[PDB]
Every structure is written in structure tokens, then in C-alpha cells.
Ligand SMILES: COc1cc(CN2CCOc3c(cc(Cn4ccn(C)c4=N)cc3-c3ccc(F)cc3C)C2=O)cc(OC)c1
């Protein structure tokens with residue numbers, strides 16, 4: 286008979302795999318767009334690739350001279366970009382494991398990176414207080430944005446690549462026009478903004494501040510629509526995610542070693558995932574299935590894969 | 596060059612799908628069907644949201660109000676219905692047509708609805724009162740499409756009679772006829788308001804400057820000899836023309852080169868309807884009764 290919409294009140298994420306192999310803190314985990322792989326970066330100077338579904342170690346990618354803060358996938362899942370304390374980014378062929386380009390220009394640690402949807406560009410944020418825009422094909426820096434007055438905590442492209450959002454310890458989030466490099470909007474109280482990214486519809490940004498607060502902003506109207514709290518975040522730049530494959534949740538790590546999951550709309554906590562033995566610095570949501578990756582700092586050094594029915 | 600790839604297949608209709616339209620706020624997709632139902636789906640995730648019901652026979656067409664809060668539907672039951680999308684309730688039934696209602700649209704301001712019917716008329720309705728304001732004796736055969744200009748001052752209509760006409764909304768008087776005349780199966784204004792895209796049942800789409808009554812571009816390679824197939828301007832990425840086709844593919848042309856930049860394969864019947872998301876490179880397509888599904892396709896460019 287009739288067709289209906291499931292409206293789960295909570296997910297039921299359960300631990301399936303614990304991925305060991307990094308020898309220092311894990312800094313970042315990201316699922317490939319095609320859903321097949323997980324990439325991890327670490328202070329141990331390595332990238333590791335794992336099967337997204339079974340956790341199975343696939344390969345180690347090496348070449349950076351110091352720790353890696355961040356990794357990101359190209360849209361076609363064939364390339365990775367990495368951000369390192371060696372002041373460089375590296376573009377990698379995931380198949381061969383080899384470095385295609387080294388992106389030189391930042392004058393201090395590179396903290397965050399992302400490809401645009403077309404994946405002809407990379408954006409980076411650095412302790413040097415700048416955001417750079419790079420040409421994937423040549424590896425040359427196209428633009429340097431004097432974006433902030435303190436380290437840049439996150440950079441993210443919107444769904445057509447026309448906008449970049451940046452955050453910083455200076456307390457600001459800024460929206461930039463990719464084409465011109467000009468600021469379009471500043472969101473300014475000002476605790477350190479530890480993380481930012483665009484919503485899947487392009488209309489909102491989710492932003493973490495080091496006052497134990499996540500906020501969903503409509504940035505055209507500069508109005509905070511939703512606030513998520515109850516977790517611990519006063520020190521680290523912790524990634525946060527929209528989970529969109531089942532119920533609509535907000536996911537973040539926490540300094541109390543748990544993964545927090547909130548109902549996006551009600552703003553209530555629906556689950557806390559226990560298992561890590563250090564700060565959960567990074568979380569990622571699988572693009573088509575209800576799968577969370579989480580990763581922790583050096584007391585733990587593991588990645589965990591959690592699966593839900595909704 | 597686009598790289599549309601299949602992301603979602605939306606099943607639920609039990610007969611042919613007739614029409615798919617994205618809400619102006621970008622959040623929803625509405626579908627109409629021969630099964631007498633409207634279905635709402637999330638534009639980004641394909642997720643079934645709700646079913647809206649009340650028509651006594653099949654539905655040919657649906658359209659959104661500018662504020663995304665209302666739908667209007669055109670039915671073989673000879674009525675249009677205005678719906679509150681939130682509640683799913685019918686607010687008004689628009690009675691007047693003496694045969695199937697084939698096509699409908701709100702004006703940009705969404706105080707008016709325009710309709711086209713097998714009765715060969717175009718009607719202009721008052722959204723707030725539901726009364727028929729004007730009946731245009733527009734055509735000498737079923738009306739295939741009706742569409743308001745960017746400012747609501749004009750209406751374009753097409754018909755199997757082979758004519759495309761532009762009407763003055765305020766007076767209901769014809770302003771121009773573009774007339775060597777295969778059935779005109781679809782027509783709509785460009786986002787600019789300057790041009791008109793028209794389909795004819797000779798496997799041809801044509802872009803017309805209607806101020807200069809000259810055909811500027813011609814798009815072929817698709818099959819269209821039988822059905823009234825929607826066509827679109829895609830303006831979120833590159834400038835493309837999108838249309839369904841009787842060979843079960845979605846065609847995308849470079850507007851200027853008139854070259855087939857892509858063909859989207861997946862449907863197992865005539866692709867009767869396509870829509871382009873208002874702010875993202877997302878295509879909705881929908882097919883007839885061998886298929887009965889809607890598909891959502893996404894590109895980066
Ligand atoms: C003024 O003082 C500060 C202090 C900080 C604190 N801080 C830096 C220490 O190390 C971190 C931190 C967060 C991450 C997670 N991460 C990575 C990219 N993104 C978007 C993100 N959220 C990873 C590392 C890290 C880096 C290199 C490694 F080799 C190893 C690890 C584990 C973190 O919280 C940051 C800041 O400016 C950003 C300034």
C-alpha cells in the first residue's frame with residue numbers, strides 16, 4: 286500500500302573495525318567520494334589508505350618530511366592532497382602512491398586543505414595566516430589571500446567552487462570569492478573558530494568555536510539557526526560533519542574521547558560513541574552508507590569504523 | 596563540459612510520471628503522474644518526503660509558487676488544484692476547462708496561474724480567489740505548454756495546431772504568432788526573457804529570438820515525434836539545453852555550438868520530463884510507464 290518516510294529518533298552506530306598502524310596521533314580521516322576508501326593522515330608523516338567497508342589496510346603513502354595535519358580527495362577519487370608541517374602540500378596519485386606535485390609557498394605549517402568540486406583547484410590554510418589557491422595541473426600558487434590575523438583552522442569550497450569559507454583562531458569566519466580572491470562576508474565576541482564547512486545545500490556553514498559550541502549559520506542572513514553543545518572542545522581543531530545518508534545528524538569528535546551525534550533539527554544528542562582513549566580529533570561520514578570513521582590523538586592512534594541502520 | 600552522473604533513482608509512482616519540477620528554494624522536487632498523485636522528494640538526497648492526493652484522474656503537470664509554499668496541478672479530471680505543500684491539503688480547485696488540463700504555471704509574483712487544456716483554451720486564474728479571470732481562445736488543437744515571462748507581463752503558449760503565440764497577460768490579447776508547421780510540443784521563455792525554446796514533433800528543438808522572429812539555434816540528435824517533452828535552460832554551470840527523448844536518454848547540448856555534450860542513459864522508457872536545479876548542477880529526469888522512476892544526476896561543472 287502506501288509509501289512513507291522513515292523518521293528515526295536516533296541512529297545505532299556500533300563499532301565494527303579498529304584500524305591500527307599509525308605510530309603517532311592521527312590528524313585527519315576522509316572517505317573517498319566513490320565510497321571505496323578511507324584515507325588517514327598522521328603526525329607520523331604518513332598517509333594510510335584503508336577499505337571503507339572492511340577497514341582493511343591497503344597502502345601507506347610517504348614523502349612528507351614532517352607531520353601531516355590534513356588530507357583530502359579529488360572528486361574522481363584518484364588524487365589526494367596533503368597538508369604538512371613541512372610547509373608544503375603534496376598531490377598524490379592514489380593508485381601508484383607517488384607524489385605528483387609539491388605545493389610550495391606557505392611560510393609556516395600547512396594545517397588544512399581541500400579540492401574544489403571540479404578538482405582543478407586546491408585551497409589551503411596555514412599557520413602563516415594565509416589561504417592559498419593552487420592550480421592542480423601545474424602545482425603553482427594562483428592566489429594568496431591575506432585571510433586572517435592568526436592560524437587558519439579550516440578551508441572549504443562550496444558545491445560549485447565559487448566560494449571558499451575560512452576560519453581562524455583570530456575569531457573570524459570569512460567567505461571568499463574564488464575567482465577574485467575578495468572577501469564577500471565576515472562573521473564576527475570572538476572565541477577561536479576551530480572548524481568550518483559549507484552545508485550540503487550551500488546555504489549554511491557549520492562552525493566550531495573553542496567554547497564547546499557548534500553553530501549552524503545562514504551566512505547570507507548572518508543568523509545562527511541551530512546550536513549544538515554538550516561535548517568538550519576548548520583546545521583542539523576538531524572536524525565536524527553533516528550526516529545525510531540516513532537521519533539528518535551532526536557529528537563531531539570531542540576532548541572527552543567520544544563521538545557526539547546530534548539531531549540537526551532538534552539539536553538534541555541522539556548518540557555518543559565510546560571506544561577511543563584520547564581526543565577524537567577527526568570524524569568523517571561515508572558518502573552513501575551510514576558509516577562513521579573516527580580518529581584519535583597519540584594515546585590512542587587508532588581509527589574506528591562505526592555502522593548504523595539509520 | 597558537464598559530467599552528470601546518476602546519484603538517485605526515485606521509485607514510488609505506479610503509472611507513468613508526467614512532470615518533475617524543482618522548488619525555487621532548491622530544497623524539493625515535485626513529481627506528477629498518471630497514478631493521480633503528486634510526490635515530493637528531497638532535491639539533494641532523493642528521499643521520499645510525502646504524497647499529495649485528491650485528483651480523480653491522472654495528472655499531467657505541476658508547478659511551484661515563487662515562495663515554494665504552494666503547488667498547482669493540472670489533471671485529466673478537467674481541474675487544477677492549488678495545494679499547501681506543508682500540509683498536503685487542497686486549498687482550491689480551479690474549475691472551468693471542458694477537457695483535460697495539460698499544462699500549468701504560476702507567474703513570478705505567484706498571484707496568477709496560467710493553464711492550457713485539450714479544450715484548446717488557455718486560462719488565467721486568480722490564485723487568491725480561485726476564479727478564472729480570463730479564457731483565451733488560444734489555439735485550434737490541444738495546448739502543449741504555457742509559460743510566463745520573467746515579469747509576468749507575457750504568456751507563451753504552444754499547440755499541436757503548429758502555432759506558438761505570445762499573449763499580453765493584462766488584456767489576454769495575442770501579441771505575436773510564430774507560424775510549414777509540425778505540432779509544437781513544448782515552449783518556454785529563457786531566464787533572460789529575451790528568447791523562447793520550442794520543441795516540434797520532428798525530432799527538433801529550436802531557440803527563437805521572438806522579438807526578431809528568427810531561429811538562432813537548432814538542436815537535434817534526440818528523438819521526439821510523439822510526445823510533449825519538457826526542455827530546459829541549464830544556467831547553474833555552463834549554458835546548456837537539456838531535453839528528454841523517446842530513445843530513453845537525457846540530451847544535453849552546448850547552447851552555442853549546438854553539440855551534444857552529454858547523453859544520460861539509465862531510463863527504460865521515454866524521458867518525458869526534465870528539470871534543472873535552480874542553484875546546483877542537478878538534473879531531474881522522469882520516464883513513462885515502462886520505467887515510472889525519477890532519476891537525479893549531478894555534475895561538478
Ligand atoms: C594558536 O595555536 C593553535 C593551536 C592549534 C591546535 N591544533 C594544532 C596541533 O595539531 C592538530 C590540531 C588539529 C588537527 C585536526 N585538523 C587538521 C586539519 N583540520 C582542518 C583539523 N581540524 C590536527 C593536528 C595535527 C597536526 C599535525 C600533525 F602532525 C598531527 C596532528 C594531530 C590542533 O587542534 C591549531 C591552530 O591553528 C589551526 C593554532
Ligand SMILES: COc1cc(CN2CCOc3c(cc(Cn4ccn(C)c4=N)cc3-c3ccc(F)cc3C)C2=O)cc(OC)c1
Nearest residue numbers: 611613628629653654655656697698737739822823824825
Ligand atoms: C492530439 O493528441 C495529443 C497527444 C499528446 C501526447 N501526450 C499526451 C499523453 O500524456 C502526456 C504527454 C506529455 C506529458 C508531459 N507534459 C506534461 C505537461 N507538459 C507541459 C508536458 N510536456 C505528460 C503526459 C501525461 C498526461 C497525463 C498523465 F496522467 C500522464 C502523462 C504521462 C504527451 O506527450 C499531447 C497533446 O497535446 C498536449 C495532444
